[PDB]
Amino acid sequence: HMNKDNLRSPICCILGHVNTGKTKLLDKIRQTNVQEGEAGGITQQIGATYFPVEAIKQKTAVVNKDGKFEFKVPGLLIIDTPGHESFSNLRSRGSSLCNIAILVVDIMHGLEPQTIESLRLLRERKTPFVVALNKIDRLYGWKKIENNGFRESFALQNKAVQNEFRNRLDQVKLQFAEQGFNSELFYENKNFARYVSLVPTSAHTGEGIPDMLKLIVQLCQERMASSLMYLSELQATVLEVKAIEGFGVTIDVILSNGILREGDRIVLCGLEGPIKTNIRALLTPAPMRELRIKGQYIHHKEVKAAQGVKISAPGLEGAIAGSRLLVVGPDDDEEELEEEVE
Numbered sequence: 001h002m003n004k005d006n007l008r009s010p011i012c013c014i015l016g017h018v019n020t021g022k023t024k025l026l027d028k029i030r031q032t033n034v035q036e037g038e039a040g041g042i043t044q045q046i047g048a049t050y051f052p053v054e055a056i057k058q059k060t061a062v063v064n065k066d067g068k069f070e071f072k073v074p075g076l077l078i079i080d081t082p083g084h085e086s087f088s089n090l091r092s093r094g095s096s097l098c099n100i101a102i103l104v105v106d107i108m109h110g111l112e113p114q115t116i117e118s119l120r121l122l123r124e125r126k127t128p129f130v131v132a133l134n135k136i137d138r139l140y141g142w143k144k145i146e147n148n149g150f151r152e153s154f155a156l157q158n159k160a161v162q163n164e165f166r167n168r169l170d171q172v173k174l175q176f177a178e179q180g181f182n183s184e185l186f187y188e189n190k191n192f193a194r195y196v197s198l199v200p201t202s203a204h205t206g207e208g209i210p211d212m213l214k215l216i217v218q219l220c221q222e223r224m225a226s227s228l229m230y231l232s233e234l235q236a237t238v239l240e241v242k243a244i245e246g247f248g249v250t251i252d253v254i255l256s257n258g259i260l261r262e263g264d265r266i267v268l269c270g271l272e273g274p275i276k277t278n279i280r281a282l283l284t285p286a287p288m289r290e291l292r293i294k295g296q297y298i299h300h301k302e303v304k305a306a307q308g309v310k311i312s313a314p315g316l317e318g319a320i321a322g323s324r325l326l327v328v329g330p331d332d333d334e335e336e337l338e339e340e341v342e
C-alpha cells in the first residue's frame, strides 16, 4: 500500500484577504493570465490546478541547485479560493478539502479581516500552512531578478529596502503572535513542526515563489500525516454542477482520495434524493491549467487522487454542491450505497 504506484498527490488550499495576490501567484507558476480575465479582478469560485512533481522540481531548481532535495510526492493539487468577504462559504469548502495550505498576506498591509477568518479555518482543522508574505516588489526601491530565490535577491537590495523589509516583517510577526501563532522568517525557523514559516514573495516578479513551492512540498512530506502520502479509500466532493457544450449537465469534483475510472457507477446527493449514474467521461484540464476555466479537456480511463475532475454522466441535474460522491464496488449493494452517501 506504500508502493510507488500507490502515491497520492496532496491538496493545498490558497487562502487570504481580498486582492492579496492568491491568483496572481498561481498565474506566475502556471504562466497563465486567469486574474486578468476575472470580472472585477476578483475570484468568485473555487479553482483547481494540478502541478506534476516534474514541474515543481523545475520551478524550485534555483533553491535546490545541486538537485539533492528529495521530492517524494507525485504532484500537488492546488485549490484557489476567493478572498472577497461575500464568499466565506467557498473559503470554508476549500479549507475543508485541503491537507496543507498557503496563507497569503500582503506585506504592505499585514493581517486583514479575511486573513483572520482564514486563520480560524486553519486553526480549526490543525492544517499545516506556510505564509506567502506577498508583494515584496512594493518595498520602495526593490531591485528584481525574475523568478529568483528570495535570499539571493534580498542580498542585492539597498540598505533602505532591507530596513523596510525587516520593519514590515517584525510588524507581521507581532500580528501573528496576537492571533496565537508564532512565526519565523522561513530560513530562521528552527521549529518547522510547530512554528509558521513566512516566505516573502512577489507574484509580479516571481521572486520567492521557488522558496514557497519548496516549503509546501516540505509541509506535505514533514507535517502532513504520512498516511496521506498514499492512496486509500475513495473520497470525493462535488464543487459545482454546470451545463457545458456537448457534454450537457456535468459536475466538477475534487477527488480527494482513491481512484476514479471511466464507466464507474457513482452515487451522490441530489435535490430529490440520491443520484445513481455511470461516468461517461472522466475529464481533467491540461496539467497546470485551471478547472474553473473553460479549455479543451483531457479524457482519462483513470484518475488517481488528488485531482480536480469534470464528470459527464446522465442524470446529474440537481446534484448538490458539497455532496460526497461514492463508487459502487463489486462487494457493494448499489441501493445500500445510495443511503450511505446522503
Ligand SMILES: Nc1nc2c(ncn2[C@@H]2O[C@H](COP(=O)(O)OP(=O)(O)OP(=O)(O)O)[C@@H](O)[C@H]2O)c(=O)[nH]1
Residues within 6 Å of the ligand: 016, 017, 018, 019, 020, 021, 022, 023, 024, 025, 035, 041, 042, 043, 081, 082, 083, 084, 104, 134, 135, 136, 137, 138, 201, 202, 203, 204, 205
Ligand atoms: N505589485 C504587486 N502586485 C500584486 C502582486 N500580487 C498581486 N498583485 C496585484 O494585486 C491585485 C490583486 O491580485 P489577485 O491575484 O486578484 O489577488 P487575489 O488574492 O487572488 O484576489 P481575490 O481572489 O479577489 O481575493 C492585482 O492587481 C495584482 O496584479 C505582487 O506580488 N506585487
Ligand SMILES: [Mg+2]
Residues within 6 Å of the ligand: 022, 023, 024, 042, 043, 080, 081, 082, 083
Ligand atoms: Mg483570486
Ligand code: NA
Residues within 6 Å of the ligand: 018, 019, 020, 041, 042, 043
Ligand atoms: Na482579486
